[PDB]
């Protein structure tokens, strides 16, 4: 039965890089597609990354590309996403999910509890008017 | 990407009613339809797949209908454990693309706003 359970996301300074983790179970992991998806205060769902069984092939969306980094280990599986260059755009509550079927092009099984990322110092500081 | 949208935004009915909610794609996206419910505080949960299929163990009282462009989800009775915000969700092409959501919601006091 999926258990995806996800920890490491906290505050973070602007600049700043994360490691979320997710750990997956009753299921062979190592068959699966996985993904991880996010949700914005006051926004609907974008799908970040996904990763191909193997730790083959990996792809992002446009939005993240080089600042986030996907990575499985298949010998505990588990997930990672590293996320470098912290932006404010990132804050959201993070999702790790299963791919229904082994495949990119699939709607999502089973979603994990959801860890928050909050990319905030003090909003914004400007004085010149 | 692929634009999905959500008709509509937010509603709000009663126990035992029967409720629609549009999900429109800008390709044609054969029918590669996911539909999710997300109680506050919850993950989404797979409803529908494959524009028709429900997940299992899905009542059979969320339905999902349509192919191309237009799609349809049909709740036939209100329930209150459906309180939530409904998701659709192409599988077409990457970026995999969320529609905007439609939150369903019970009457609630304020003049069902009708003026």
């Known amino acids: 039965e999926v258990h995806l359970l996800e920890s490491g996301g906290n505050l973070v300074q602007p600049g700043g890089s994360l490691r979320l983790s997710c750990a997956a179970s009753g299921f062979t992991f190592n068959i699966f597609v996985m993904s991880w998806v996010r949700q914005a205060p006051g926004k609907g769902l974008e799908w970040v990354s996904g990763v191909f069984g193997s730790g083959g092939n990996t792809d992002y969306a446009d939005a993240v590309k080089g600042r986030f980094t996907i990575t499985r280990d298949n010998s505990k599986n588990t997930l990672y996403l590293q996320m470098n260059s912290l932006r404010a755009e990132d804050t959201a509550i993070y999702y790790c999910?299963?791919?229904?079927?082994?495949?990119?092009?699939?709607?999502?099984?089973?979603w994990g509890q959801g860890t928050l990322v909050t990319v905030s110092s003090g909003s914004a500081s400007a004085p010149t008017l | 990407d692929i634009q999905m949208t959500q008709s509509p935004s937010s509603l709000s009915a009663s126990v035992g009613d029967r409720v629609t909610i549009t999900c429109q794609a800008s390709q044609d996206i054969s029918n590669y339809l996911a539909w999710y419910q997300q109680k506050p505080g919850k993950a989404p949960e797979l409803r529908i797949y494959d524009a028709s299929n429900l997940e299992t163990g899905v009542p059979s009282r969320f339905s999902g209908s349509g192919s191309g462009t237009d799609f349809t989800f049909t709740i036939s009775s209100l329930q209150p454990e459906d309180i939530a915000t409904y998701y659709c969700?192409?599988?077409?092409?990457?970026?995999?693309?969320f529609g905007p959501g439609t939150k369903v919601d019970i009457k609630r006091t304020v003049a069902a706003p009708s003026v």
């Open positions: 999910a299963k791919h229904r079927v082994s495949y990119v092009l699939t709607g999502f099984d089973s």
């Open positions: 969700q192409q599988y077409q092409n990457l970026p995999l693309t």
